[PDB]
């Protein structure tokens, strides 16, 4: 699919510590490349993959200054929404934002987004046209009126159509070996006798990137799709992903079942079979 650059902000009020904690994570596609955490030593934007480490100190300085000011805004924001909702000062609350841009075939913005949630429920979002906002409730209508008077949607649109895709294109270049060269899955099938009339076959896909993948089981042509248990794709720990898909088959037959693997790192769909 199209490449993307996205940031994820979580602000949490911490009345037990007298402040609020602000964390930001940045992603290119499925790769976390930066983080900020103001409970960490010397809060700052920090690298989390090798290829962003080639940015010079002014890049880090600007990202740190900018996110520190955002954390400030979100600390007051938690204060303000607590008032909108008539909530007490003793409890902890959550303000989240996600925003990002997808890259079109011309190097321009394909589509982008900016959305907020308060205590895990949608609060306000920039609409698809990047010129208007949708407020979830009467509280977010207050925020909406402030952002409209400040012409915040134009600021969003400009960022998404400009800095966001331009930064994306630069990151895609610096991290080409991982962001633009897919790593195919390493695949194997295991067999577990599970009952007198059933054997469990598990098809593994390990160490792949990007995270999108298709694993399916098929006996001589038709796709098995009532109950083949498939785990949620999960991180490997090294920036790659893993997944498996399992189904129960009669002991007469394991050889007759085929696991099919679709991933961008494979020139052609892969088939795997018995155990």
């Amino acid at each position: 699919g199209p490449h993307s650059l996205s940031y994820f902000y979580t602000a949490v009020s911490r009345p037990d510590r007298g402040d609020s904690r602000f964390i930001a994570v940045g992603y290119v596609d499925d790769t976390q490349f930066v983080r900020f955490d103001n409970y960490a030593p010397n809060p700052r934007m920090e690298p989390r993959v090798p290829w962003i480490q080639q940015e010079g100190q002014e890049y880090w300085d600007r990202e740190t200054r900018n996110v520190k000011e955002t954390a400030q805004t979100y600390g007051v924001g938690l204060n303000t929404l607590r008032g909108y909702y008539n909530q007490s000062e003793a409890g902890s609350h959550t303000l989240q934002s996600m925003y990002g841009c997808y890259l079109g075939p011309d190097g321009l913005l394909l589509h982008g987004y900016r959305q907020d949630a308060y205590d895990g429920a949608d609060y306000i979002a920039l609409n698809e046209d990047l010129r208007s906002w949708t407020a979830a409730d009467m509280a977010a209508q207050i925020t909406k009126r402030k952002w409209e008077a400040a012409d915040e949607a134009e600021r969003a649109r400009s960022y998404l159509q400009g800095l966001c895709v331009e930064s994306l294109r630069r990151y895609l270049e610096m991290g080409k070996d991982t962001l633009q060269r897919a790593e195919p899955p390493k695949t194997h099938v295991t067999r577990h006798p599970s009952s007198d009339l059933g054997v469990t076959l598990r098809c593994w896909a390990l160490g792949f990137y990007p995270k999108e993948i298709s694993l399916t089981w098929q006996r001589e042509g038709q796709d098995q799709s009532q109950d083949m248990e498939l785990v949620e794709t999960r991180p490997s720990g090294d920036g790659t992903f893993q997944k498996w898909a399992a189904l129960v088959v009669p002991p007469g037959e394991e050889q007759s079942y085929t696991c099919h693997v679709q991933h961008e790192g494979l020139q052609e769909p892969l088939t795997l079979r018995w155990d």
């Binding site: 902000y9 930001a24 890049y59 990202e63 955002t70 805004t73 979100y74 952002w147 400040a150 930064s167």
Partner: peptide, 9 residues
């Protein structure tokens, strides 16, 4: 790079 996100709630 991050957006300028400082307009009050």
């Amino acid at each position: 790079m991050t957006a300028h996100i400082t307009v009050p709630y």
